[PDB]
Design a protein around this ligand. Structure first.
Ligand SMILES: CCCCCCCN(CC1CCNCC1)S(=O)(=O)CCCCn1nc(C)c2c(C)n(-c3ccc(C)cc3)nc2c1=O
Length: 147
């Protein structure tokens, strides 16, 4: 293959998403805790989160990942699909990743066009594109329910 395909596969085979917390950015209280690897591609993951998260002005997303491979510029492109059409796009950059390292990464998700939980629940899918700089490594998807 292009050998970039092989590098991308190398990075993916050595990557794990170990845990993720979603916090109310006002209090730090944990609204949702996940220990399963919801970055695995080729599946449609599901996350059931408390509907009150929709009333937080901001959510602090704190995750922990491991990577056997070095990355020059680990970053995410995330698309929020509502009823199959892109509603919002998020961009987050981690930067350099030491080979065989385990790293905690905090990002703030900030807010309007806010719809009720009954409308959003089961109709929101987050597509996450995992890049090292300009190299697309993987794409994973999670469907959100607001309970
Ligand atoms: C227009 C908005 C409509 C929809 C609601 C917006 C979403 N809301 C945001 C708040 C903001 C403040 N106003 C209220 C709403 S929300 O419901 O609180 C999201 C909680 C967090 C959503 N989330 N969930 C999971 C499970 C994620 C995973 C697995 N990965 C991931 C990371 C790295 C890799 C490699 C792969 C995947 N990233 C995830 C992620 O971002």
């Amino acid at each position: 293959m292009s050998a970039k395909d092989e590098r991308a596969r190398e990075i993916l085979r050595g990557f794990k998403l170990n845990w993720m917390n979603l916090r109310d950015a006002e209090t730090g209280k944990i609204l949702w805790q996940g220990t399963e690897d919801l970055s695995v591609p080729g599946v449609e993951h599901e996350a059931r989160v408390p509907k009150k998260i929709l009333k937080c002005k901001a959510v602090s997303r704190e995750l922990n990942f491991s990577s056997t491979e070095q990355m020059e510029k680990f970053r995410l492109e995330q698309k929020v699909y509502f009823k199959g059409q892109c509603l919002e796009e998020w961009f987050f950059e981690f930067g350099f990743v030491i080979p065989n390292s385990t790293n905690t990464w905090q990002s703030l998700i900030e807010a309007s066009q806010m719809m009720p939980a009954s409308v959003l629940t089961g109709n929101v899918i987050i597509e996450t594109k995992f890049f090292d700089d300009d190299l697309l490594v993987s794409t994973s998807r999670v469907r959100l329910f607001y309970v």
